[PDB]
Amino acid sequence: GKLLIEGKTKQVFDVPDQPGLLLNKDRITAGDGAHDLEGKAAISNQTNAKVFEILKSAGIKTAFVKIASETAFLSKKCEMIPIEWVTRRLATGSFLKRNPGVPEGFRFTPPKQETFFKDDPQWSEEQIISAKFNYNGLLIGRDEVDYMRKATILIFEILEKAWALRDCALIDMKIEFGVDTEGSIVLADVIDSDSWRLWPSGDKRLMVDKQVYRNLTTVTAADLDTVKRNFAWVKDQLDFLKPTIHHKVVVFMGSPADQEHCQKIAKAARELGLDVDLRVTSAHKATEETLRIMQQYEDTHGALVFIAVAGRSNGLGPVLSGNTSYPVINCPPPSDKLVQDIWSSLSVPSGLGCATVIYPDSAALMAAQIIGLQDYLVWGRLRSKQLDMAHSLRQADKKLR
Amino acid sequence: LLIEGKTKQVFDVPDQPGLLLNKDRITAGAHDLEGKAAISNQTNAKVFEILKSAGIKTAFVKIASETAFLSKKCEMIPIEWVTRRLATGSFLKRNPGVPEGFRFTPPKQETFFKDDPQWSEEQIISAKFNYNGLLIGRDEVDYMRKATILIFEILEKAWALRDCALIDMKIEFGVDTEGSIVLADVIDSDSWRLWPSGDKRLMVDKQVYRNLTTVTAADLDTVKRNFAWVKDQLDFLKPTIHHKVVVFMGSPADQEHCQKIAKAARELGLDVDLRVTSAHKATEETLRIMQQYEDTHGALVFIAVAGRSNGLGPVLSGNTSYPVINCPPPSDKLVQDIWSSLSVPSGLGCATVIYPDSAALMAAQIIGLQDYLVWGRLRSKQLDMAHSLRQADKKLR
């Protein structure tokens, strides 16, 4: 195809037969300013593809489609916003110079998020809005900037979580956005070892990112070798960042009439990425088999959450709660009588940890939030959903306004 | 004793355990002389009276002479706290592309160090400042940010009475002997940027002086007349607005409850009448009493207090066009009785509240639409409540 953007470290060519883009990474390392050559285009492409796979799986919207080759990938075509979106958890790097008196390692809670223009000075959100950027029919106002701030922090938080599985502190990051043909903002650049600052064991001294290359006043080929060896370690480490954690959410309904209600729970949880079993059993009509079924689920080494669905007077949830140590959530089905009956769920006898929820979606969310403590991906999807809902409100606000 | 400055001197006052600030007749944007210490001092004192009247905690006590005032002695935090409503001045230089007049909602608030480089809140925190035993942490910075915005908002509202747009401000904070942060130093025409009619051309602040490269005595005269005008306009900024809040109780038995309403509203600056009448047992006289209150040109809020089945509130509402609030007294039956207050017949604007403090607030929120000082105190109380929570949190933490 035809070239449409040239870059220090990458070229992006049109793909005219497939209505996108192809991004081709080059074997150069351009320490901000210094520039030398390497064998690193393959390392970056793989690092990148892996990250975008993690982010797609969380539900974040990206331009990334699939790897084309060992050095290139296919991207959805979109017009880039000329802002670098940067997130920090700690104070380090150029931030220390811009903010004298703040010591290295000062923790940003929530993560600090800053913006930078080309061509590369710092901009305020006000500056971005007054700049009146316009891409693919989408004019960038505070709503669009709000979304990108929130998205940037979120992507940092997800990856921060991922890297902690291999004992690495993600310290800061830079990403870039673009606007697709349909007017949607997508995460669109490249996230590799040039995009971030990584500390193993939270030890700055063990840094594995492109800061190693920046620190070099003089650059020998030997020096470049440790930087290639550093980036390869990171590309390798990413293969451990998407693990399959084992868990089961079991919904016990006291009667088969509660089916549609349970399927609403199931549908919600499965979309959050949960493994859900629907079971029918009564704590009144089949007391012994109820315990026997729950004991069978208790033969696991994975995580386990029970959801109790029982109309009228709910003894099922409290009886589970009394015989198991795994969390039990009560989700009575909808009913006119729920106003009277809910106290059979609440107000359990002393020493039972049964918790109560009133809507099927909210029960799946409780189960997700519990299991997300072990599966950063589920936890990612919960945060992504919050961003989705907030972004949808603005769409609605814009229509009634 | 002494503390020295460009525009002011602060001497100890040894007989009164607690400072005097003596204003100088100089203007240091570069530096010249005038007759303006008296203007500044008086400008300041009027500003501090208004903020004291809103409930803001200040070092300021009273005017001592024509050019001095008495202040509670306290150690200054070396930060200038700046609030802007509009984009202008050095902000434009620090944020290229943002046009003059860009509106900041909420008001933008930035901090500057005494050396004047800009600092972030992080820088202020990492500086580990310590005055009178008070180390300045994120909580203290939060308070000063929130108060600075609050103080700008109060003055913005006040200057709007004399048709002046307050565009930005600078204030300074200090720490008293008891470890409390007070709004201190001086607020005068050097402290702010004032535009009449929102017109940049008609500016009345020290910006006129700052823009001069060359400075004549005529130029100084126009600065004095501008500052004298501002001092003069400040006298119309604290006017007596007329309003009445009337509490009708259905029985003298509801006495403590109504007094709790009265007490709360009086703290917010409201004029309250407590009256006894029944909409059942004295229907015609109930109407008669509200028509007596309706002979005004001021604002009027009726609060109806009725136990059991409340016909009082809805009856007032059906017969008047002034806002009526229901505030039933506390009771076991309130869970049942409350629907007599809610669920009025169609065409009644009777609104309902359940706590006596909260009725007084509704009343004040309504009246504050016409009385910025009452409006001030509501915001000031929200600030008090939030700062109290942090103290309570620090003790249980």
Short mmCIF file of C-alpha atoms in Angstrom, two decimals, chain A:
data_model
loop_
_atom_site.label_atom_id
_atom_site.label_comp_id
_atom_site.label_asym_id
_atom_site.label_seq_id
_atom_site.Cartn_x
_atom_site.Cartn_y
_atom_site.Cartn_z
CA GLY A 1 0.00 0.00 0.00
CA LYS A 2 0.91 3.70 0.38
CA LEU A 3 2.85 5.20 3.30
CA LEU A 4 0.84 7.65 5.35
CA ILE A 5 2.95 8.29 8.43
CA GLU A 6 6.68 8.07 9.05
CA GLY A 7 8.07 7.56 12.52
CA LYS A 8 11.31 7.34 14.47
CA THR A 9 10.67 3.67 15.22
CA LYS A 10 7.76 2.64 12.96
CA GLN A 11 6.15 3.12 9.55
CA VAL A 12 2.41 2.90 8.94
CA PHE A 13 1.34 1.95 5.45
CA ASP A 14 -2.14 1.90 3.88
CA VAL A 15 -3.61 -1.49 2.94
CA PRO A 16 -5.75 -0.59 -0.12
CA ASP A 17 -7.33 -4.01 -0.68
CA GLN A 18 -8.56 -4.43 2.90
CA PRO A 19 -10.39 -1.28 4.04
CA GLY A 20 -8.69 -0.68 7.39
CA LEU A 21 -3.80 -0.13 7.76
CA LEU A 22 -0.42 -1.90 8.34
CA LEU A 23 2.05 -0.81 11.01
CA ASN A 24 5.64 -1.85 10.44
CA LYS A 25 8.17 -1.56 13.29
CA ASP A 26 11.77 -0.64 12.42
CA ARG A 27 14.97 -1.85 14.08
CA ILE A 28 15.93 1.54 15.53
CA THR A 29 15.99 2.92 19.09
CA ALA A 30 15.44 6.68 19.35
CA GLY A 31 16.23 7.81 22.86
CA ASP A 32 14.44 11.12 23.24
CA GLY A 33 16.40 14.18 22.15
CA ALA A 34 20.57 10.05 20.36
CA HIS A 35 19.58 7.22 17.97
CA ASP A 36 21.27 3.89 17.23
CA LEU A 37 20.34 0.58 15.49
CA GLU A 38 19.40 -2.95 16.71
CA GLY A 39 17.57 -6.26 16.13
CA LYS A 40 14.48 -5.06 18.03
CA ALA A 41 11.53 -4.67 15.62
CA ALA A 42 10.40 -8.23 16.37
CA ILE A 43 10.64 -7.69 20.14
CA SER A 44 8.46 -4.60 20.04
CA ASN A 45 5.81 -6.05 17.73
CA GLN A 46 5.38 -9.05 20.00
CA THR A 47 5.44 -6.95 23.17
CA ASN A 48 2.81 -4.71 21.66
CA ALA A 49 0.49 -7.40 20.29
CA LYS A 50 0.46 -9.06 23.69
CA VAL A 51 -0.50 -5.86 25.53
CA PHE A 52 -3.30 -5.05 23.09
CA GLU A 53 -4.61 -8.60 23.48
CA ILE A 54 -4.76 -8.07 27.21
CA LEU A 55 -6.58 -4.76 26.75
CA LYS A 56 -9.04 -6.06 24.19
CA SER A 57 -9.91 -8.85 26.58
CA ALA A 58 -10.72 -6.27 29.27
CA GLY A 59 -13.08 -4.60 26.82
CA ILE A 60 -11.03 -1.47 26.04
CA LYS A 61 -11.56 -0.40 22.41
CA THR A 62 -8.40 -0.49 20.23
CA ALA A 63 -7.29 -0.06 16.63
CA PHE A 64 -5.37 -3.32 16.96
CA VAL A 65 -6.64 -6.28 14.94
CA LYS A 66 -3.96 -8.95 14.56
CA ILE A 67 -0.28 -9.58 13.94
CA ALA A 68 0.61 -9.49 10.24
CA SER A 69 4.15 -10.73 10.67
CA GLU A 70 7.03 -10.86 13.10
CA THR A 71 7.67 -7.14 12.81
CA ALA A 72 4.29 -5.78 11.69
CA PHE A 73 0.61 -5.72 12.64
CA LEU A 74 -2.83 -4.85 11.27
CA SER A 75 -4.60 -1.86 12.72
CA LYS A 76 -8.01 -0.30 12.19
CA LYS A 77 -7.38 2.97 10.28
CA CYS A 78 -7.99 6.20 12.24
CA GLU A 79 -6.85 9.85 12.54
CA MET A 80 -4.51 10.35 15.45
CA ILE A 81 -4.97 12.93 18.18
CA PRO A 82 -1.52 14.54 18.51
CA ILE A 83 -1.44 14.12 22.30
CA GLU A 84 0.71 11.78 24.32
CA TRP A 85 -1.38 10.59 27.29
CA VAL A 86 0.93 9.86 30.23
CA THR A 87 0.12 8.15 33.56
CA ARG A 88 2.34 7.91 36.64
CA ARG A 89 2.03 5.98 39.88
CA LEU A 90 5.34 7.24 41.27
CA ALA A 91 7.33 10.43 40.84
CA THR A 92 10.30 9.81 38.54
CA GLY A 93 11.79 10.92 35.23
CA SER A 94 11.15 14.34 33.78
CA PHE A 95 8.38 14.94 36.36
CA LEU A 96 10.98 15.48 39.08
CA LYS A 97 12.61 18.26 37.07
CA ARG A 98 9.27 19.93 36.34
CA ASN A 99 8.24 19.71 40.02
CA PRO A 100 11.29 20.48 42.23
CA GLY A 101 10.92 19.42 45.91
CA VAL A 102 8.86 16.29 45.19
CA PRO A 103 11.11 13.27 45.87
CA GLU A 104 11.55 10.28 43.58
CA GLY A 105 9.09 7.55 44.55
CA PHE A 106 6.31 9.91 45.71
CA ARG A 107 3.11 7.96 45.15
CA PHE A 108 0.23 9.24 43.05
CA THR A 109 -3.11 8.23 44.36
CA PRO A 110 -5.04 8.11 42.08
CA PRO A 111 -2.47 7.85 39.28
CA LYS A 112 -1.33 11.21 37.98
CA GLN A 113 -2.37 11.76 34.38
CA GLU A 114 -0.74 14.39 32.13
CA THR A 115 -0.94 15.45 28.52
CA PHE A 116 1.67 16.40 25.98
CA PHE A 117 1.51 17.97 22.56
CA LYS A 118 3.90 17.51 19.62
CA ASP A 119 6.31 18.48 17.72
CA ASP A 120 6.76 18.23 22.77
CA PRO A 121 5.37 20.65 25.46
CA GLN A 122 2.93 19.94 28.28
CA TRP A 123 -0.69 21.02 27.76
CA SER A 124 -3.55 21.50 30.12
CA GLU A 125 -6.96 19.99 29.41
CA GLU A 126 -8.05 23.57 28.76
CA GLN A 127 -5.33 23.85 26.11
CA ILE A 128 -6.53 20.72 24.38
CA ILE A 129 -10.12 21.99 24.31
CA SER A 130 -9.28 25.50 23.16
CA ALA A 131 -7.11 23.95 20.42
CA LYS A 132 -10.32 22.70 18.79
CA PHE A 133 -8.88 19.53 17.21
CA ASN A 134 -11.22 17.89 14.69
CA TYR A 135 -10.78 14.35 13.37
CA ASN A 136 -13.07 12.17 11.29
CA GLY A 137 -15.95 14.49 12.15
CA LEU A 138 -15.33 14.22 15.86
CA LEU A 139 -14.48 17.53 17.41
CA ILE A 140 -12.56 17.00 20.67
CA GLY A 141 -14.25 18.78 23.56
CA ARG A 142 -14.17 18.23 27.32
CA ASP A 143 -16.30 15.09 26.95
CA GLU A 144 -13.75 13.52 24.63
CA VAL A 145 -10.91 14.66 26.85
CA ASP A 146 -12.81 13.30 29.88
CA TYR A 147 -13.05 9.90 28.20
CA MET A 148 -9.32 9.82 27.29
CA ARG A 149 -8.23 10.83 30.78
CA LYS A 150 -10.40 8.14 32.25
CA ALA A 151 -9.28 5.59 29.65
CA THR A 152 -5.59 6.34 30.10
CA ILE A 153 -5.78 5.91 33.87
CA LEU A 154 -7.74 2.68 33.36
CA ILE A 155 -5.25 1.13 30.93
CA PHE A 156 -2.46 1.97 33.32
CA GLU A 157 -4.39 0.36 36.19
CA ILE A 158 -5.03 -2.85 34.21
CA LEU A 159 -1.42 -3.23 33.10
CA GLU A 160 -0.25 -2.23 36.57
CA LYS A 161 -2.26 -5.18 37.81
CA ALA A 162 -0.94 -7.55 35.13
CA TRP A 163 2.74 -6.76 35.74
CA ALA A 164 2.38 -7.45 39.47
CA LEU A 165 1.87 -11.16 38.66
CA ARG A 166 5.49 -11.31 37.60
CA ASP A 167 6.59 -9.03 40.47
CA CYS A 168 7.10 -5.94 38.29
CA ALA A 169 6.05 -2.44 39.26
CA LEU A 170 4.61 -0.52 36.33
CA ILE A 171 5.76 3.00 37.12
CA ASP A 172 4.47 5.08 34.27
CA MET A 173 3.11 4.85 30.72
CA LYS A 174 2.43 6.74 27.52
CA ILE A 175 -0.29 5.92 25.02
CA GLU A 176 -1.89 7.68 22.07
CA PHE A 177 -5.47 7.81 20.70
CA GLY A 178 -7.04 8.17 17.26
CA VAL A 179 -10.57 8.65 15.88
CA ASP A 180 -11.94 5.91 13.61
CA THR A 181 -14.07 6.34 10.50
CA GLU A 182 -17.28 6.15 12.53
CA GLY A 183 -16.24 8.92 14.93
CA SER A 184 -15.15 6.62 17.81
CA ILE A 185 -12.02 7.15 19.91
CA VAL A 186 -9.73 4.13 19.86
CA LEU A 187 -6.47 3.33 21.70
CA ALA A 188 -4.28 3.33 18.68
CA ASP A 189 -0.51 3.64 18.88
CA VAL A 190 1.96 1.08 20.17
CA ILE A 191 2.61 0.04 23.74
CA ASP A 192 6.03 -1.60 24.11
CA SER A 193 9.17 -1.19 26.25
CA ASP A 194 9.55 2.28 24.77
CA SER A 195 6.13 3.26 26.10
CA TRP A 196 6.67 2.54 29.77
CA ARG A 197 8.86 2.44 32.84
CA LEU A 198 9.19 -0.99 34.46
CA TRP A 199 10.73 -1.89 37.79
CA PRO A 200 11.17 -5.51 38.92
CA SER A 201 10.61 -5.86 42.67
CA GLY A 202 9.82 -2.14 42.62
CA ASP A 203 13.59 -1.70 42.44
CA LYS A 204 14.45 1.25 40.20
CA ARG A 205 17.95 -0.19 40.05
CA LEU A 206 16.60 -3.23 38.16
CA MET A 207 14.73 -1.14 35.51
CA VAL A 208 14.08 -2.96 32.23
CA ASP A 209 12.60 -0.18 30.12
CA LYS A 210 13.98 2.37 27.63
CA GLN A 211 15.29 4.45 30.56
CA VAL A 212 18.39 2.24 30.48
CA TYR A 213 19.06 3.52 26.98
CA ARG A 214 18.37 7.16 27.95
CA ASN A 215 20.85 7.00 30.84
CA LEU A 216 23.68 6.23 28.47
CA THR A 217 25.86 9.27 27.84
CA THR A 218 28.06 7.19 25.57
CA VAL A 219 26.67 4.26 23.60
CA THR A 220 28.69 1.16 22.68
CA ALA A 221 27.24 -1.94 20.95
CA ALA A 222 27.73 -3.79 24.21
CA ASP A 223 25.44 -1.24 25.88
CA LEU A 224 22.83 -1.86 23.19
CA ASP A 225 23.13 -5.60 23.85
CA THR A 226 21.93 -5.28 27.47
CA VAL A 227 19.02 -3.15 26.19
CA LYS A 228 18.07 -5.84 23.63
CA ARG A 229 18.43 -8.45 26.32
CA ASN A 230 16.24 -6.32 28.58
CA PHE A 231 13.42 -5.93 26.04
CA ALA A 232 13.50 -9.66 25.21
CA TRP A 233 12.99 -10.50 28.88
CA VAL A 234 9.91 -8.28 28.95
CA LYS A 235 8.50 -9.79 25.70
CA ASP A 236 9.02 -13.17 27.32
CA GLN A 237 7.42 -12.17 30.62
CA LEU A 238 4.17 -11.14 28.89
CA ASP A 239 3.38 -14.78 28.18
CA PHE A 240 2.68 -15.20 31.91
CA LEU A 241 0.41 -12.15 32.08
CA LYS A 242 -2.81 -13.74 30.78
CA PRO A 243 -3.30 -16.78 33.04
CA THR A 244 -6.51 -18.84 33.32
CA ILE A 245 -7.57 -18.68 36.99
CA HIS A 246 -10.08 -21.31 38.06
CA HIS A 247 -13.38 -20.32 39.61
CA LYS A 248 -17.00 -21.27 39.69
CA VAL A 249 -20.11 -19.25 40.45
CA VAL A 250 -22.96 -21.60 41.34
CA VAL A 251 -26.55 -20.37 41.36
CA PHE A 252 -28.94 -22.55 43.39
CA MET A 253 -32.61 -21.93 42.61
CA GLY A 254 -35.22 -23.48 44.93
CA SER A 255 -37.67 -24.03 42.06
CA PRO A 256 -37.39 -24.40 38.25
CA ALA A 257 -39.83 -21.49 37.91
CA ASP A 258 -36.94 -19.16 38.84
CA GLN A 259 -35.20 -20.05 35.56
CA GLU A 260 -35.35 -16.83 33.53
CA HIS A 261 -34.20 -14.91 36.63
CA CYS A 262 -31.16 -17.17 36.96
CA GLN A 263 -30.38 -16.94 33.27
CA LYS A 264 -30.30 -13.14 33.69
CA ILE A 265 -27.69 -13.64 36.40
CA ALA A 266 -25.84 -16.13 34.29
CA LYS A 267 -25.84 -13.91 31.21
CA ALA A 268 -24.42 -11.03 33.17
CA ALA A 269 -21.68 -13.04 34.87
CA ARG A 270 -20.57 -14.80 31.72
CA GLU A 271 -20.12 -11.43 30.01
CA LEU A 272 -17.96 -10.37 32.95
CA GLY A 273 -16.03 -13.57 32.22
CA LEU A 274 -17.33 -15.91 34.92
CA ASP A 275 -17.96 -19.67 34.81
CA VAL A 276 -21.50 -20.18 35.94
CA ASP A 277 -23.48 -23.29 36.83
CA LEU A 278 -27.24 -23.17 37.29
CA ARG A 279 -28.56 -25.74 39.75
CA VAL A 280 -32.01 -26.56 41.07
CA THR A 281 -32.41 -27.67 44.70
CA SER A 282 -34.63 -26.92 47.69
CA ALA A 283 -33.47 -26.36 51.26
CA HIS A 284 -36.96 -27.42 52.44
CA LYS A 285 -38.06 -30.16 50.05
CA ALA A 286 -34.62 -31.71 49.59
CA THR A 287 -32.52 -30.65 52.58
CA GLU A 288 -30.02 -33.56 52.47
CA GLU A 289 -29.37 -33.38 48.69
CA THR A 290 -28.99 -29.60 48.88
CA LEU A 291 -25.98 -30.04 51.21
CA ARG A 292 -24.68 -32.96 49.14
CA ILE A 293 -24.67 -30.82 45.99
CA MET A 294 -22.90 -27.95 47.68
CA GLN A 295 -20.36 -30.33 49.17
CA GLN A 296 -19.56 -31.53 45.66
CA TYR A 297 -18.71 -27.96 44.64
CA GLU A 298 -16.60 -27.72 47.80
CA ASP A 299 -14.23 -30.32 46.29
CA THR A 300 -12.10 -27.71 44.54
CA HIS A 301 -8.91 -25.70 44.86
CA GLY A 302 -10.35 -22.84 42.84
CA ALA A 303 -12.52 -19.95 43.97
CA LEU A 304 -16.18 -20.54 44.69
CA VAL A 305 -19.20 -18.27 44.97
CA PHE A 306 -22.79 -19.41 45.62
CA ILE A 307 -25.82 -17.41 44.53
CA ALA A 308 -29.10 -18.29 46.25
CA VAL A 309 -32.32 -17.70 44.34
CA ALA A 310 -35.47 -18.55 46.31
CA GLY A 311 -38.89 -16.93 46.10
CA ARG A 312 -41.20 -16.53 49.10
CA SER A 313 -39.52 -17.31 52.43
CA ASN A 314 -35.85 -17.90 51.60
CA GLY A 315 -34.31 -20.66 53.70
CA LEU A 316 -31.93 -21.80 50.94
CA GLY A 317 -29.45 -18.96 51.18
CA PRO A 318 -29.26 -19.00 54.99
CA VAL A 319 -28.96 -22.77 55.05
CA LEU A 320 -26.03 -22.65 52.58
CA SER A 321 -24.54 -19.86 54.59
CA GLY A 322 -24.73 -22.07 57.68
CA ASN A 323 -23.02 -25.06 56.07
CA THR A 324 -20.32 -23.51 53.88
CA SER A 325 -17.43 -21.15 54.27
CA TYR A 326 -17.62 -19.80 50.75
CA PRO A 327 -19.46 -16.49 50.21
CA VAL A 328 -23.21 -16.85 49.68
CA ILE A 329 -25.25 -14.13 47.95
CA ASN A 330 -29.06 -13.97 48.04
CA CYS A 331 -30.85 -12.81 44.93
CA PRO A 332 -34.59 -13.25 45.31
CA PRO A 333 -36.50 -13.15 42.01
CA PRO A 334 -38.85 -10.21 41.31
CA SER A 335 -42.25 -10.36 43.00
CA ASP A 336 -44.89 -8.11 44.48
CA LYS A 337 -44.21 -9.91 47.74
CA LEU A 338 -40.46 -9.12 47.67
CA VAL A 339 -41.24 -6.18 49.95
CA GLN A 340 -42.37 -8.58 52.70
CA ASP A 341 -40.25 -11.58 51.79
CA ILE A 342 -36.88 -9.94 51.61
CA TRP A 343 -36.53 -10.06 55.37
CA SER A 344 -36.23 -13.84 55.10
CA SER A 345 -32.98 -13.13 53.22
CA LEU A 346 -31.83 -10.26 55.41
CA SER A 347 -32.01 -10.80 59.18
CA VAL A 348 -30.26 -14.13 59.30
CA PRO A 349 -29.46 -15.87 62.60
CA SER A 350 -26.30 -14.84 64.39
CA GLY A 351 -23.10 -16.18 62.86
CA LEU A 352 -24.23 -16.37 59.25
CA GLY A 353 -22.49 -14.26 56.60
CA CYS A 354 -25.16 -14.47 53.94
CA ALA A 355 -25.35 -11.13 51.98
CA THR A 356 -28.39 -9.85 50.09
CA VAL A 357 -28.81 -8.22 46.69
CA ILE A 358 -32.08 -7.40 44.88
CA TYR A 359 -31.36 -7.34 41.11
CA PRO A 360 -29.91 -10.15 38.95
CA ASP A 361 -27.31 -7.92 37.31
CA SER A 362 -26.13 -6.68 40.65
CA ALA A 363 -25.70 -10.24 41.95
CA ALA A 364 -23.46 -11.18 39.04
CA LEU A 365 -21.47 -8.01 39.76
CA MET A 366 -20.99 -8.97 43.42
CA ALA A 367 -19.78 -12.41 42.30
CA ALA A 368 -17.50 -10.74 39.76
CA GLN A 369 -16.09 -8.30 42.31
CA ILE A 370 -15.30 -11.22 44.63
CA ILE A 371 -13.60 -13.31 41.93
CA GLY A 372 -11.87 -10.23 40.49
CA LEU A 373 -9.70 -10.26 43.60
CA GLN A 374 -7.97 -13.24 41.98
CA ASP A 375 -8.43 -12.54 38.30
CA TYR A 376 -7.26 -9.11 37.20
CA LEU A 377 -9.09 -9.61 33.93
CA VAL A 378 -12.49 -9.87 35.57
CA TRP A 379 -11.51 -6.88 37.69
CA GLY A 380 -10.51 -5.04 34.49
CA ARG A 381 -13.93 -5.74 32.94
CA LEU A 382 -15.73 -4.30 35.95
CA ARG A 383 -13.77 -1.05 35.60
CA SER A 384 -14.34 -0.99 31.88
CA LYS A 385 -18.05 -1.35 32.44
CA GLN A 386 -18.07 1.70 34.75
CA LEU A 387 -16.32 3.72 32.09
CA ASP A 388 -18.82 2.47 29.52
CA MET A 389 -21.80 3.50 31.64
CA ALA A 390 -20.41 6.94 32.38
CA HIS A 391 -19.62 7.50 28.70
CA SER A 392 -23.16 6.39 27.79
CA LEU A 393 -24.72 8.92 30.18
CA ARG A 394 -22.99 11.70 28.31
CA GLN A 395 -24.39 10.37 25.03
CA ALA A 396 -27.84 10.53 26.63
CA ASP A 397 -27.20 13.92 28.24
CA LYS A 398 -26.21 15.32 24.84
CA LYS A 399 -29.60 14.20 23.37
CA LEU A 400 -31.95 15.70 26.03
CA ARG A 401 -29.89 18.80 26.68
#
